[PDB]
């Protein structure tokens, strides 16, 4: 399993503009288009992103293109962020995927506010960190996904995704 397989399980794939768990306009593999309530704003962002007139719909091809860019951006944002890079560099390969997944979903900024959990992950206190991550808006709003990420940080294995 790899970061792409993992995110593709968590995000799904949709070829038509759709709304987030949050109500935001999205497309592809979890590519947020806008937080604005107009489909028209969304459509415009869409066309800007793909470089063609899409009229609200993209090919698989395009979805994966966006996905490649978004993963690249998440990794780069982790590296650019002092607090994030620190924990990243301290972690093993599988747990690094769990951090990337959080950043993709929540943005650099959001994850950086998980101060206490980041600290615990750094110290390799897996069980404690898993308990702290669960005390969040994140966990309460998307419990099944948060819990797969969390098991990933807890165990260092891909078992949570084996099922799936």
Swiss-Prot record:
Effect listed in the UniProt record for changing residue 26 to E: Complete loss of activity at neutral pH; covalently bound substrate
Role: Endolysin with lysozyme activity that degrades host peptidoglycans and participates with the holin and spanin proteins in the sequential events which lead to the programmed host cell lysis releasing the mature viral particles. Once the holin has permeabilized the host cell membrane, the endolysin can reach the periplasm and break down the peptidoglycan layer.
CDD domains membership: T4-like_lys (cd00735)
Protein's GO biological process: cell wall macromolecule catabolic process; defense response to bacterium; peptidoglycan catabolic process; viral release from host cell by cytolysis
Entry keyword set: Antimicrobial, Bacteriolytic enzyme, Cytolysis, Glycosidase, Host cell lysis by virus, Host cytoplasm, Hydrolase, Viral release from host cell
Lineage: Viruses, Duplodnaviria, Heunggongvirae, Uroviricota, Caudoviricetes
The keyword Hydrolase appears for this protein: yes
GO CC aspect terms: host cell cytoplasm
Annotated positions binding substrate: 32, 104, 117, 132
GO molecular function: lysozyme activity
pH dependence: Optimum pH is 7.3.
Localisation: Host cytoplasm
Consequence the record notes for mutating residue 26 to H: Facilitates transglycosylation more effectively than hydrolysis; covalently bound substrate
Enzymatic reactions: Hydrolysis of (1->4)-beta-linkages between N-acetylmuramic acid and N-acetyl-D-glucosamine residues in a peptidoglycan and between N-acetyl-D-glucosamine residues in chitodextrins
Induction pattern: Expressed late in the viral replication.
One Pfam family in the UniProt entry: Phage_lysozyme
Organism expressing this protein natively: Enterobacteria phage T4
Active site: 11 (proton donor/acceptor), 20 (proton donor/acceptor)
Name by which UniProt lists this protein: Endolysin
Family as reported in the entry's similarity comment: Belongs to the glycosyl hydrolase 24 family.
HAMAP family noted in UniProt: ENDOLYSIN_T4
InterPro entries noted in UniProt: Endolysin_T4_type (IPR034690), Glyco_hydro_24 (IPR002196), Lysozyme-like_dom_sf (IPR023346), Lysozyme_dom_sf (IPR023347), Phage_lysozyme-like (IPR052619), T4-type_lysozyme (IPR001165)
